[PDB]
Design a protein around this ligand. Structure first.
Ligand code: HEM
Ligand code: HEM
Lengths: 145, 145
């Protein structure tokens, strides 16, 4: 269950999540857009899903993409803040899950975000240990998809 | 015009928004649910729009309502954090606007949130001065609906 996946996040994992978020979460506009642009660059097959955003190749100049990217970073902020209470983490995770289920996004497709996250983390010198921690958090959402 | 509305956020208004947010934003779960339950209580005609959340009268005990409420508070956190740059504030406001336009929510009905905000602020000892400040921020979203 989603609860099982959340309850499985250890103190060490939460520590790495919080430490890395202190940095990548400090520039939501910059890192948020970087995350989306990396997703489109390495997984071009996902571009079609974001037609509402218009031409995503415009990057920062695209107001719809910028608004989307910043908002996505607050969803992650939400997750990070609820880490110590699995009950609260689960209900916010399920909220995000529903928004993607309605778009026909499978658990496997949702996991495509791990690549971009790893690269963005690496840009700030956060290695594999941190990428693995984030994959565990993403896995919590996948449990609901 | 969302841009003209955003221009109404003067130095004094922004200060009042930040000062009051430091208090109400400290407990997103509690105040988030308080806002929603107040909305449903004072404006029963809006409950129909929230069919997905199930029995909203259950308040905090309703997992979907709690998840929804916390997420809403992060939308406000988003707005507050973008007060420095009007171009960024506008793109995140339009993002939220789209989510309501699709649910057929008009500017007039969106404005029904002012009552709840006024009451929640009042319970924390923040009077009309602050309620009016928030009314102006809500007005920015209304301009995009
Ligand atoms: C870190 C993981 C992710 C998070 C936290 C996340 C978060 C979000 C949020 C908050 C929204 C806005 C929901 C709304 O207002 O309707 C959104 C929309 C969306 N997401 Fe994700 N997402 C993630 C990964 C993905 C991935 C990997 C895909 C695709 C393979 C995806 C596809 C979509 C689509 C299609 C939309 C709708 C965009 C639109 O039309 O406005 N998401 N996501
Ligand atoms: C401070 C004002 C408000 C803010 C910042 C706000 C923010 C949000 C956010 C972020 C969501 C989640 C979007 C999603 O993931 O689909 C949402 C959903 C929604 N909002 Fe609002 N909202 C506000 C006022 C209102 C009002 C006054 C109404 C109606 C009278 C309304 C009706 C809805 C509905 C119907 C949903 C969909 C709920 C669901 O089915 O899950 N909102 N709102």
């Amino acid at each position: 269950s989603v609860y099982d996946a959340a309850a499985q996040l250890t103190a060490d994992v939460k520590k790495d999540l919080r430490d890395s978020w202190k940095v990548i979460g400090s520039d939501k506009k910059g890192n948020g857009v970087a995350l989306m642009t990396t997703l489109f660059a390495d997984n071009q097959e996902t571009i079609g899903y974001f037609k509402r955003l218009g031409d995503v190749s415009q990057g920062m100049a695209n107001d719809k993409l910028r608004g989307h990217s910043i908002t996505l970073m607050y969803a992650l902020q939400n997750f990070i803040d609820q880490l110590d209470n699995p009950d609260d983490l689960v209900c916010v995770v399920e909220k995000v899950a529903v928004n993607h289920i309605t778009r026909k996004i499978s658990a496997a497709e949702f996991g495509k975000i791990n690549g971009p996250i790893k690269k963005v983390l690496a840009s700030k010198n956060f290695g594999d240990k941190y990428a693995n921690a984030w994959a565990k958090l993403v896995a919590v959402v996948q449990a609901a998809l």
